[PDB]
């Protein structure tokens, strides 16, 4: 506690009261007539000081500091996530203990946490009879983190492993857990420091915080004490000179990084870590995100002109791809303009999740199923696919990263609209030129010829299927005839009703004749298929028979109200037509007047039936924001639902955050 | 006596095609979100249409308490997508009395976390599981809700 | 860690594999007939038990837990703030030691260190008499946290303090500094616990964790994350059933406050401490914010139908004078809308403000005030009477805070602007009785008499003054003019000059005779008669007179300019008369046309006297901000380039969650 | 060398009556902030344009060192003003080169210190002090600025 070596990189001193042995050693590397009145011995000490106190990034002190610049530079080949060139390097026979300190490292990595502690117990038993206790301490924290890695593994198996994972798992064999539980039963942490040799507590204090949980816990108060203070500045919206709350935070975050990876220690990959990488991460997204919109008074353009804005490069892509979750994913893009941050050197994030998705189809392609390794890289790749729309791909990377999305990733995470909605949004950045069309005929083409059976049935979170994968293509190609199902279709007899009806909602995409065939033994008129004909406008307007079975549906739905009335039920249904017959009737679609028969039987049916006598303290404002656009600017023309809008508008806007309402109310209302 | 205020749920999960009783008991967290959005996978029609209201709409939720089951994870130790049925009980502000009961179910969900909790602490048990709201063409799905207190 | 305890009272079973003896105390409670089974020695442990507990609160285990409602009461003089009653507690004879430890307390709550020192020494003296352990650690740490109060305050006032004051105002007599220092050269207070014999951690093991820093660290970064578990939900639209993830920040809100309080710790009075209250509190307002407006289809209000909807209680408001800052409660304001929640218990809220000016009173009515106490209480009474802007005042109770406010609190801490902003504050939500008209009354009259002088300057920071004391009175009842206050105040045979500065001050509440004698002694001109008069009485309907003086403005103005641009200097002048005097224009108070001879040369201006030729490149958003509201409606009216406005608010309302930026795009230009 | 991106600031303090000094090497977090906001009232009348604008103008600062100079530190050791001169330089981003050098200087400060810093651990110093823009009753003063990059 003699000096301070702040995040910046200067050194204030804190307690000396004789000669400054600190400000000398700078005073010696900045002069150079000096340096040579040194021996040779005394040379080589102060040329390996210089070398360690240059690549440790200490530069100058606060009475020289200046303008500095720092870097990062990680070389652990963990972070660049090659796991090819690891599995390369683990077949070769280790030479030093640091060696197999770094293999051990890898394996756990890897996720072959098996013989990882085999591995530990090797460099345990072959570095007592040496001098340099770094290795032996590290080797016991390596060791214990395994240890309850797989403790906590064991439990979450037996737990809801045989739920999530459909078939229950055992990785670990008996005997092994069984060893290692009877030597680490009476295994305590608080005391390795204290009752290990009395020379690694002198000359190693620096590596007393690994001991207990206390050296997060440090991290995490100040980058708490950062998040507050953040907060405020931003609530307050003043000005930071010199450095700043976010670069402190960035830099000691690399830092943390840097130092927890090198190292090779563990430690980098539990939920604690993650939740610290993550804070800090959305910390300065969100921070990003704010300083884009400052107001600018009167002192903005005379200091910070032309905004030197956040460049988010590939050190900032590869940690957001690793730890995040998709849920905080969408909790944060939803405050910030997460398109507009631009993206540097797009190569190696581009050969990043190239890289992904090669190993993924490698891994998936292989009947061994790793399910260690498999647990803990789901998150990361979706992760890494997420973020991914975000940058421009190349066109061979944009081949890959569909050809792997859409074949080789396991239904269980996926489902069909959560990848249709993935790809989607992948491809609002980049073009659609025939590769990727043809990447996703093919698997339009897989997915329709796995169903033929009578038992293949399907499910999607939004019930999207793979009509609208279909609409996408006619939404960019236009001529698309598809050979394969116009062939199929040729085949397709009779007694396919599923495979019939599910291709039928593929019909722009079919071949004329194909279409003229499949017009034949079609669902006459099912009632969810004539909601489905006039979806885009198969058959073009109603027909007297059309409206004759939606007034029997409405029929059977009333009575079906009237026996949950009876028997006091409320039903919510993802095909809720109610809200249609009134839109349909709102725009003239439908003349007919049995309509009003039903009214009061659903509050969006009561609301757009019945403009005139609805209950508009009944008006959910969560309703305005699945209509269409025109469906705005006819409801913007009619009297009867004007004067209540304008006012449920005005009350959301002040009393809500969302920015849509918002927009609806100033593009369209006024 | 002061000011806290608690109450208390009760949270059901079923399997299709049998009547098996696997699963926790008494939600913890119980955090319920209804979510629904819109994007621009329309943008462009060969216009005259009607309407789709596609909405998306989604829902999620999670409990965490353990102890699911013994006996019924024996015989299963050796895809029907799970169906889930809720209890809770509403009070009057007027009288607070024990007069209704509340009913939901959910036919078609997905208990989909992470395989990893990763965490340096023992813990108390409680591996939280997040649930989600399935979708099939045919009908219905989502939620049916029960009203008592016919009084 | 047999068992792990839940913040509600709960208890689960945590390492127990064998008979859970909390189980069978539970059910033993529950059963008398089982209590009867128990002598007289094992019913009298019993007892003791269940009285012990019922003060812990130990309610019940997990899986019988129903609906719980546990209280909560601070018993803590010091946490009611009754100082008299702590006066005349000390005064009494010692009687034990706890009681000694108690007065040893209630010292360092008042702040005479000095002597709390000496007594803690003396029981720790003493102490050996009776065989007590928790004593000795408690005194232990009250002495550690004693001596770090001393030398942080005595370090200050040596480096800030003086400065402050003016006066090196040395609370300490150089001996006793000689002495803490001699006494604690080489402790470190880690080993503290560590080195109290055996049978003290075989006993007294749960209160280790105070010795060291991490007494609070644990908490803080439990809170923290709390605070992102709340966030996580916040924009998700939740409804957490149960026991929400904000009840449990309350709860252990109030846990800490009873343990750090009631044991009669020194802890209280840091910052570190103050970082939990603080913290906690405001996403307490958070989510009760987010909780009073929200939307819901069916089941939204149907998951916990009730809210407590933060119901503040005497509990809650020490908290808020004891743990914030006028800057806290100010971004407190501008996130929350205080002004919707509801006060409850509004009762001892009276007692409160009451102790705290009576306290002021006696601080600062005689020539003795000590410093010591003025360390610590200048931050409660500033948060206490800037919160109370919401409280429903009782008559006795207002007249005695605002007498309290403007005649005893130091006028180093606050500027007669800032007493201005106060004052309506407390009036926001109340009326004006004779009572309050009577004092601010007497106030204006004896501060005009306190700074009439030579050298004396009044200097403030918000430019505000006794003659808008006056105008808020008229502005709620003008039928009392004056009595005789004008009078005394108008006794002048020429005399000196600043009198009159604050002569034509006061002008609204000033005789006949007084305005009279106005008129005699010089006119209505002057540079800041406009800010003065054209505030108050004259404003508008005619100002012709000043157009000599407008154009000198003017030419000045214009040399200043044009210096500014031969040399590059440009300047600022905060007090920009030019803008009211383009306002003017705008506003067709000015019909000459030289004034188009001034073009070019002020922003505002340029944007006021010449709409034809004024770029609009040039916007500023901070204009958009203020406004007004008449004229504000009138340049709405405008034709030429009414959408410009109309396009930049837009632009900022869409990237701004500013409520005022919509509340003035929406009321007045739609 | 990749991306920190750091500068500096030049902090000076001087007491009317006389050319006293005080000066800050560094000022490490300098929080600026401006703030104009208005009132609650209705008097209205509508022959009275209310022009208001509510011009007002508060001004917060920081600065922080560990020099406070010692030569009549130790004078006054055994109410003339506390003004601050802020230096500081710019760039041209195009050329990157040192051309242009901004001053700042208040004619009315008062320093607002509070005086509850009093924390639990010992820390790097670093006594953050915090100002007010105050103002007079005759005109002009705070805002005045000096610009350089004559060339």
Redesign the interface.
Known sequence: ?DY?F?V?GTV?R?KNKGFGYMERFFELKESCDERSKLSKKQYERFNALFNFFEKNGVICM??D?????????INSLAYHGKYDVMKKFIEEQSVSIEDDYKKAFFLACLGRWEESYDLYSNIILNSIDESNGCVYYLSQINRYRIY??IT??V??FN????????R?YKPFTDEFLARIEREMTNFNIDDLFNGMPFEFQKKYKILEFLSD??F???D??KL??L??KVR??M?????????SSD?VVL?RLYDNLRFLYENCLW?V????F??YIR?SMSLLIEKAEYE??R?????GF??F??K?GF?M?YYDFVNISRHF?I??IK?LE??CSIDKIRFGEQEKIEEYLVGIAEEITKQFSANGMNVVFY??FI?EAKAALYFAKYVKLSEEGLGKIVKALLFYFPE??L?IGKRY?WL?RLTKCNELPKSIISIIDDFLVLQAEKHIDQNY???????L?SR?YG??IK?FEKNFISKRLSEITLCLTQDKQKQIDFLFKLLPLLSTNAKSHLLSFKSVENI?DLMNG????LI??FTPEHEELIIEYLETRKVNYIVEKE?????????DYM??FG??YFLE?INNSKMEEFIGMDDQYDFFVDPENFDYKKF???WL??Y?DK?LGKIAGNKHMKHHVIEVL?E??????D?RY??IL?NYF? | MKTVIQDTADVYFKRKSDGKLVFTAEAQTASFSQAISEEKLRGGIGNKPLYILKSEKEINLTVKNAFFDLEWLAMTQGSERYEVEYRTIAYNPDTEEVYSDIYIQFPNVSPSGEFEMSLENGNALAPEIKFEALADTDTDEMAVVIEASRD
Chains 1, 3 share one sequence.
């Open positions: 506690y301070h702040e910046n204030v804190h606060a009475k500091a200046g303008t500095l610049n720092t870097s990062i530079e309850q890695s906590q593994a439990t979450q737990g809801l492993g045989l739920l999530t994972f459909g229950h949980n206390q997060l816990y440090d995490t108060v708490f004490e998040t507050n405020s500045e609530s307050e919206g003043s000005y930071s000179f010199g450095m670069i830099l430690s990959s539990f939920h604690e993650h939740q804070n884009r919109t107001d600018i008074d009167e002192l005379s200091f002109g032309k030197s460049f490069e979750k849920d905080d909790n939803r405050s647990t803990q998150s269980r995470d489902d909605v989607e049935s399907e499910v999607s979170s939004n019930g299927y609208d609409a996408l939404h969810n006039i979806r885009i406008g073009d307007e028997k006091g039920i409320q039903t919510f249904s993802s095909n809200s249609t839109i349909w679609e959910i404002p969560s924001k699945n269409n469906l005005k959301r806007v002040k009393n809500s955050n920015k918002l927009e100033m006024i």
